[PDB]
Ligand binder design. Structure first.
Ligand SMILES: Fc1ccc(-c2ncn(C3CCCCC3)c2-c2ccnc3[nH]ccc23)cc1
Length: 289
């Protein structure tokens, strides 16, 4: 079907829904996200506004086209490759220290860029980072701005107020302690969540993963409690101290503190150099044959 002037829609990729497509005119594959014009909760146009504000940043996917066609609102992106969850599954849920550290360097940089554009992400998880294709295959991208919010006024740089008594909107596995306590999310929270993602890659799972409970809200209570009763030195036992030092620093941040991103990158860089690794972008999955 003839989306825009110059895009052919293909079959679904996964999860509105995501499709493979072709830029017929340029001879490139693309990713297409459709949303029905009458949902109860229209979101794509809002998301697209944010993706547009992010454009030009390293590892932000490039919008080809937004519009509407027939029954649908439409956004078209340059094609990207598999997520970190997909590549983690493909690697038997085991990443080397070198791979974790290569990813951590880029991942901190993307969150910092988002924050520079006056937003917080609030769904930092392996599924929302994708590797590029082709020439861009060494580059980690971030996606999914459906849960994102402005944390300061674009002009006045005025932080949003400290609020309580909130819901847990994102993914519970990687959520911050302050999020479980129902406190308003800020920059520190995106970074703490990254901290849990990194240990996830180290361990193959997290200790509060796979808790049975009867209801959903009961399951979140159980995750919260497990997190809050698992000291950082226990979570990180048997891995370089840097993972612990990073999570402790994140948990020390005040609501409206600007994180020292540079310090966090330097932490993992120094570890990287002590191990004698080279920044040559050869991830575990590149060595498959
Ligand atoms: F305009 C957009 C087009 C696609 C997407 C998207 N959402 C989710 N994904 C993937 C689907 C496969 C599982 C992992 C998440 C995409 C997506 C898929 C492929 N290459 C892409 N390039 C940019 C986003 C995206 C988001 C906005």
């Amino acid at each position: 079907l003839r989306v825009g002037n110059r895009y052919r829609l293909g079959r679904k990729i996964g999860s509105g829904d995501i499709y493979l497509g072709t830029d017929i005119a340029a001879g490139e594959e693309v990713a297409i996200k459709l949303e029905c014009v009458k949902t109860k909760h229209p979101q794509l146009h809002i998301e697209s506004k944010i993706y547009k504000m992010m454009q030009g940043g390293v590892g932000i996917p490039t919008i080809r086209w937004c519009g509407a066609e027939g029954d649908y609102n439409v956004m078209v992106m340059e094609l990207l490759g598999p997520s970190l969850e997909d590549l983690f599954n493909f690697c038997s849920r085991k990443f080397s220290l070198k791979t974790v550290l290569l990813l951590a360097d880029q991942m901190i940089s993307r969150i910092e860029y988002i924050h520079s554009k006056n937003f917080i992400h609030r769904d930092v998880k392996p599924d929302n980072f994708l590797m590029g294709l082709g020439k861009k295959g060494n580059l980690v991208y971030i996606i999914d701005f459906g849960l994102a919010k402005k944390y300061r006024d674009a002009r006045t740089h005025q932080h949003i107020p400290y609020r309580e008594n909130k819901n847990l909107t994102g993914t519970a596995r990687y959520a911050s302690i302050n999020t479980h306590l129902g406190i308003e999310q800020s920059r520190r929270d995106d970074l703490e969540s990254l901290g849990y993602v990194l240990m996830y890659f180290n361990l193959g799972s997290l200790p509060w993963q796979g808790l049975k409970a009867a209801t959903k809200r009961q399951k979140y209570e159980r995750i919260s409690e497990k997190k809050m009763s698992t000291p950082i030195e226990v979570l990180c036992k048997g891995y370089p101290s840097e993972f612990a030092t990073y999570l402790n620093f994140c948990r020390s941040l005040r609501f409206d503190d600007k994180p020292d991103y540079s310090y966090l990158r330097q932490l993992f860089r120094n570890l990287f150099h002590r191990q004698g690794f080279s920044y040559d972008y050869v991830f575990d999955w590149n060595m498959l044959k």
